[PDB]
Each structure stands twice: as structure tokens, then as C-alpha cells.
Write a protein that binds this ligand. Structure first.
Ligand SMILES: [Cl-]
Length: 189
């Protein structure tokens, strides 16, 4: 009646469900399911690098843990491996955008790579011009459909445009300060 779509994804994911239930209800919509790696930071990745990173993560999955955690204003270079349903909205990350996220599809070795590219990213508390890009990648048909590489990096000078939260997406500033909510680790395979 509120959770039918989420429930589909937690049929098999019991540990992940148990961990989310340990979080106060008001923060359950706010957390990412993020791998405990962490990835070394990187500039914008070549497409074959993206495909290799997701492929290696799919092969290593039984030895990689995840925590529910808040992501906020990550520095340029930040790369995360996340578990997320493609039919649910991305949780907040403190970034706002002056343009709509664009969805591209590439064929790589007979597989679909999704590229969700959000240019014109800004941090409204500290930026009056856009300075960032967020990309969300996933690789389909390799048994890793609901896992994503999320990458934050510096925008080009030419793409920088005036920023104003009043017309940005998402439309609401998140509430600060953030609570400490990071769960103990769990497995997803
Ligand atoms: Cl637009």
C-alpha cells in the first residue's frame, strides 16, 4: 500500500531488509545501499573502464559488503557501488541540478550500458554557479541489473551556468545537520 515495489526487490536481500528496518522510519527513504570498498576517487572514466569496474564488482559480489548510509555533497572524484531499483527514485546526495538528467544507452560487447548523466550540478549552500556532473551507470544482462556505479566529478568551465535552488531539481533543500545512521555491514549475495 506504500511498499509493493520495494518488497519485490527484497524477496532475495533478507539481511539488507533487516538492516533498513533498524533505521528510523523518517531516514529509510534517505539512505543509499552503498558497498564498503571504498573506490579510489577518479576523473571521468572511459566507457570500457566503467564496464570493467561493474563486471569485476559482479564477480566479487559475495566478498563485498554493503551498509545503508547517507551520501552528502561527495567531493569531485567520488565513485560508489550502489544497489538500487531502476523504478525507485535515487535517494538524496545534497546535489541539485539546473538541468534534467539525460539517459543514454550504449551497446558494449552485445550488452546495454545505461548512462544517466546529470550536468549542471551544484551545492546550493556553497555555489551560485554549476560546478559538477553526476553519472549513474549500470550494465544489463550480466546478472548485475540492480547495481550501479555512481560518479561525481568536476564540470567543464563552458558548462558552468548560474544556479538557483528555486528552479533546480530536486526542488527541496535537505534538512541539516544529518543524523549518523550508517548500518553495520551486510551481504547482498
Ligand atoms: Cl533540461
Amino acid at each position: 500500500h506504500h511498499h509493493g515495489t520495494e518488497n519485490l526487490y527484497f524477496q532475495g536481500a533478507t539481511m539488507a531488509a533487516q538492516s533498513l528496518l533498524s533505521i528510523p522510519v523518517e531516514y529509510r527513504s534517505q539512505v543509499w545501499c552503498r558497498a564498503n570498498l571504498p573506490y579510489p576517487p577518479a576523473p571521468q572514466l572511459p566507457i570500457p573502464a566503467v564496464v570493467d569496474i561493474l563486471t569485476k564488482a559482479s564477480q566479487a559480489l559475495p566478498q563485498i559488503s554493503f551498509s545503508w548510509t547517507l551520501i552528502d555533497q561527495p567531493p569531485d572524484g567520488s565513485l560508489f557501488l550502489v544497489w538500487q531499483a531502476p523504478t525507485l527514485p535515487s535517494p538524496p546526495d545534497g546535489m541539485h541540478f539546473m538541468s534534467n538528467e539525460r539517459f543514454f544507452n550504449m551497446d558494449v560487447a552485445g550488452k546495454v550500458l545505461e548512462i544517466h548523466e546529470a550536468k549542471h550540478g551544484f551545492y546550493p549552500l556553497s555555489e551560485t554557479r554549476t560546478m559538477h556532473v553526476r553519472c549513474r551507470y549500470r550494465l544489463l544482462g550480466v546478472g548485475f541489473d540492480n547495481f550501479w556505479l555512481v560518479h561525481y566529478f568536476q564540470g567543464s568551465e563552458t558548462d558552468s551556468i548560474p544556479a538557483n535552488i528555486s528552479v533546480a531539481k530536486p526542488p527541496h533543500l535537505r534538512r541539516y545537520p544529518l543524523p549518523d545512521v550508517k548500518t553495520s555491514p551486510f551481504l547482498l549475495q
